[PDB]
Design a protein around this nucleic acid. Sequence first.
DNA 1: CGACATGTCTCTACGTCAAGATAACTTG
DNA 2: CAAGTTATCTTGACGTAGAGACATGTCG
Lengths: 161, 160
Amino acid sequence: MDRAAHAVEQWRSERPDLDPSSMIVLGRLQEAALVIARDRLNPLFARYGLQPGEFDVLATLRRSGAPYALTPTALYDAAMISSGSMTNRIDRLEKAGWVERRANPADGRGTLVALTSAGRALIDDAVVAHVDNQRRVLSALSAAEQRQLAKLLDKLLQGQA
Amino acid sequence: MDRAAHAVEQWRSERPDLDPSSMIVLGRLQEAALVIARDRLNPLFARYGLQPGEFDVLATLRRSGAPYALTPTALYDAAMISSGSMTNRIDRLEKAGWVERRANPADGRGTLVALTSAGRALIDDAVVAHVDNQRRVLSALSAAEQRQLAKLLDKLLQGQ
DNA sequence: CGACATGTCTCTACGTCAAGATAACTTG
DNA sequence: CAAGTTATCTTGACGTAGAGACATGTCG
């Protein structure tokens, strides 16, 4: 029995008026996200000098195509964090020399965050190591099992939408 | 296309030398965990005056049975957080009157964190709402799909 | 226009990790 | 005993939400 299953057995004993079965799937979802980030993905980003959120900004800039420049709002909408938290991520990356701010010509309120050449070289390198890492994380599942997990998670996400 | 699928399409265009397929399942895993906690689970805990980690401690104490008393170590092992972070959680709950610290008779180094009557009443109500909340969250999946999701996540966790 | 909305940062306040401290426990 | 380990808290550092501030964009 894993953590989620054992916790459900305790609740079945302590509150027989309750059906706590839902705790298994959602507990394992939470635990999987935490463990995979903490033990597998984040140490790799750290070897490149990046926090996970910093890797995410560089990846979002890079995959958006030349000239690898996005507004803070596009970045925080993509990252699903607050505007102020995105300011902090940009500040860290800017000080490290991986991105550069400039005025957005399209909007007087705006800023464009752009990859530097050094930032682009870093993420171009890290993304390959990252995907290799992700594949190893998933290797306990067959190809078909990974596809079905992706489908089940999409159905669950569409449910929230 | 959802967020993960669109991100993968961008990578396929920008780095055709790369196979970014793994990003779909792991991106959706991360997004699902965040969105469900942010939009569904954590607001409910807040209605009871609890942070998610505080709910978790009270739940761990309650489900362990009378006298609902566990050591900080048993708690932080169950929560998968560090010892110092568990101190903070206990501090918040104790100040709020939901738990009480006492010396552990079994270990001179140790403490027992125990539910108060008010803390037990709080978690006994909140856990019912929480389970109702979880079931609605999962209602987009059939019973068989939820079982399959649970099995696939267990296989993935054992892999780690 | 003035009223309202948005982009973005600054700021407070909090949960978190890891390192360190130290009393007490374990081991041999 | 003497050395090593564990329980637990304290502490510095950092990411985070979201309120607030303010310049600039949008609306009738």
